């Protein structure tokens, strides 16, 4: 009596045939096991509920009991729910970097995450290096990037350059990355992107006591209040260290400071659902904040090592390959000179 489910990661598609009593947890486990992700703490299963709200699957309940939009298969998006503080320090596996890279690039390209042009071109140069490998004047002739969406729409139509003049600027940078591993360009992409003001921020529309409209931001470090007009710079910052507790009562959402003699900050949200979603994200972000500031578990040390073994194997498999190619590129230089 199996229900069919489709799970789409940022670059792969999975079908499972679950039982009707299968938990989110059990499905999640089959997913990360299928693609060899062990850094599971960052990720979740996203879906559309019966009213078209995009919703995180709850791992401790039956999949079928969570108001999933009815169709065969059920459709989930495997996505990053949480972002590390430093991609260099905390993204261990190749799979993990790639899914983060792809999810963040989508956000940059569709203008969800704001990016100045120069930085946009620079990020575009690292994506090109990952997709096309070392630039090559033979293979990469003019307009070899013509069929590629490399910049955000906002960059394209507020600057006078044409798409070829953008492509040319991205090419200069692509030449400088010659010798960069595909995977090492992914990380450089992430090292630039993780510094942007809007990277790793979940915003919700809120109103203050008075009633002035605002945004709330929740990220790995805490909560922020932004003006309606400006989601780049916080008005005030609420880092975990400076917060006693965080509470909702229906539409009312409250931040109580550490300083018992300091007054509480109070906000209202359009619905209870928004307030549940906000508190869950704070809980999840705070949980990983605290874990980040504790020695690697034994498990994590083994992932760090398993990761190191596998990259070495790949490094050698790329040298063994490159060695046989230079035998063949020569074996033609020999037969080309015997002719001439």
């Amino acid at each position: 009596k199996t229900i069919s489910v489709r799970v789409t990661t940022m670059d792969a598609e999975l079908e499972f045939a679950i039982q009707p009593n299968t938990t989110g947890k059990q499905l999640f486990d089959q997913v990360v096991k299928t693609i060899g992700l062990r850094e599971v703490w960052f990720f979740g299963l996203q879906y559309q509920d019966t009213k078209g709200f995009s919703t995180w699957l709850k791992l401790n309940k039956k999949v079928t009991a969570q108001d999933v939009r009815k169709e065969s298969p059920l459709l989930f998006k495997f996505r990053a729910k949480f972002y590390p503080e430093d991609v260099s320090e905390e993204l261990i596996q190749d799979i993990t970097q790639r899914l983060f890279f792809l999810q963040v690039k989508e956000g940059i390209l569709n203008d969800d995450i704001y990016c100045p042009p120069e930085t946009a071109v620079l990020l575009a140069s690292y994506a090109v290096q990952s997709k096309y490998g070392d630039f090559n004047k033979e293979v990469h002739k003019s307009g070899y990037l013509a069929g590629d969406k490399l910049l955000p729409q906002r960059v394209l139509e507020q600057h006078k350059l044409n798409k070829d003049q953008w492509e040319e600027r991205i090419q200069v940078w692509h030449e400088e990355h010659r010798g960069m591993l595909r995977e090492d360009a992914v990380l450089e992409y992430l090292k630039i992107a993780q510094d942007l003001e809007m990277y790793g921020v979940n915003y919700f529309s809120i109103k203050n006591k008075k009633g002035s409209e605002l945004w709330l931001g929740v990220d790995a470090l805490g909560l922020n209040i932004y003006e309606q007009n400006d989601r780049l710079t916080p008005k005030i910052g609420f880092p975990w260290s400076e917060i006693r507790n965080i509470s909702f009562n229906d539409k009312k959402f409250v931040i109580k400071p550490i300083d018992k003699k300091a007054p509480d900050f109070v906000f209202y949200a359009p619905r209870l659902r928004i307030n549940k979603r906000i508190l869950a994200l704070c809980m999840g972000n705070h949980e990983l904040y605290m874990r980040r500031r504790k020695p690697d578990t034994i498990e994590v040390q083994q992932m760090k090592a398993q990761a190191r073994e596998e990259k070495h194997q790949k490094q050698m498999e790329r040298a063994m390959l490159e060695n046989e190619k230079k035998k063949r590129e020569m074996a033609e230089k020999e037969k080309e000179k015997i002719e001439r």
Binding site: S241, R244, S247
Partner: peptide, 8 residues
């Protein structure tokens, strides 16, 4: 409905 998250 109410809920409290202790941060500190």
């Amino acid at each position: 409905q109410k809920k409290k998250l202790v941060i500190n």
